[PDB]
């Protein structure tokens, strides 16, 4: 799996409160986090399904 899947979630500098998903390698699943709205890193998905299909097993 891509190494970006191992990066902690990144909220960014914008001030929004947008629900996104990130893969948590320690737990083995995708979890929710609050995204600020701009400069998203790659371990940031709009759905748990997209996240698992991209990072599952990392």
């Amino acid at each position: 799996r891509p190494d970006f899947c191992l990066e902690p979630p990144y909220t960014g500098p914008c001030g929004a409160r947008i629900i996104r998903y990130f893969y948590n390698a320690k737990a083995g699943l995708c979890q929710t986090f609050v995204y600020g709205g701009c400069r998203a890193k790659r371990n940031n998905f709009k759905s748990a399904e997209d996240c698992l299909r991209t990072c599952g097993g990392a």
Binding site: T11, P13, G15, A16, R17, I18, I19, G36, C38, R39
Partner: protein, 238 residues
């Protein structure tokens, strides 16, 4: 516009607002009622917010709200007909961070629901001018406060702002704060208003800033004077 039926009495380190004293403040929520951004009514059919909020026609505009934790509170849940994101919004630099929302059904203006005034492209709000920002964003950098918050803060000169943010400050941005208060997660899209001949006028839209909502760091807002011509043009065409 710009004249609340209920006068206000004058976000991290801000204070609770008088219920309904910022009648143009709206809450942008998803279909489940989850608040993700703020916005400002500019008339009965349009709301102005930030482009980074990524609003869609599946989201809703909630007007006349004060306490989001109150199920009995009377509010207006308005559907969004179309979203007009400024095509010049730069997803890299965050410049031109503005989006207009056209409501499916007009909002019913009242003592707790009305519009904020828009400035003229040539308006000059001097640095040091005390303005106000409002919203339901975090009060501590965690869940959002139930009741609408507010904070008085000074506008900063671009030179002073650049002393911290350097070249990240672009032409459609205006800074304010670094004075003991700070906008924070959930405040985006909300208003930064200053008085123009006594009427509260939209000078900025909460955009970005300190990644920890530091109260000693300049907050950055979309500069409405640099984007109002686009606003008027969009309204006139729709």
């Amino acid at each position: 516009c710009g004249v609340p039926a209920i006068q206000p009495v004058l976000i991290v380190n801000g204070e609770e607002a008088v219920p309904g004293s910022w009648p143009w403040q709206v809450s942008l929520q998803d279909k489940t009622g989850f608040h993700f951004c703020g916005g400002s009514l500019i008339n009965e059919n349009w709301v102005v917010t930030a482009a980074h909020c990524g609003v869609t026609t599946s989201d809703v505009v909630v007007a006349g709200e004060f306490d989001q934790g109150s199920s009995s509170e009377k509010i207006q849940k308005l559907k969004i007909a179309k979203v007009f994101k400024n095509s010049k919004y730069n997803s890299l630099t965050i410049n031109n961070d503005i989006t207009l929302l056209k409501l499916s059904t007009a909002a019913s203006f009242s003592q707790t629901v009305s519009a904020v005034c828009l400035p003229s492209a040539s308006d000059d709000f001097a640095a040091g001018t005390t303005c106000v920002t409002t919203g339901w964003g975090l009060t501590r950098y965690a869940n959002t406060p139930d009741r609408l918050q507010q904070a008085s803060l000074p506008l900063l000169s671009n030179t002073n702002c650049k002393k911290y943010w350097g070249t990240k400050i672009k032409d459609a941005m205006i800074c304010a704060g670094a004075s003991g208060v700070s906008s924070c997660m959930g405040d985006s899209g909300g208003p930064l208003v200053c008085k123009k001949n006594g009427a509260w006028t939209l000078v900025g839209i909460v955009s970005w800033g300190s990644s920890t909502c530091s109260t000693s760091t300049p907050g950055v807002y979309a500069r409405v004077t640099a984007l109002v011509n686009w606003v008027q043009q969009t309204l006139a065409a729709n």
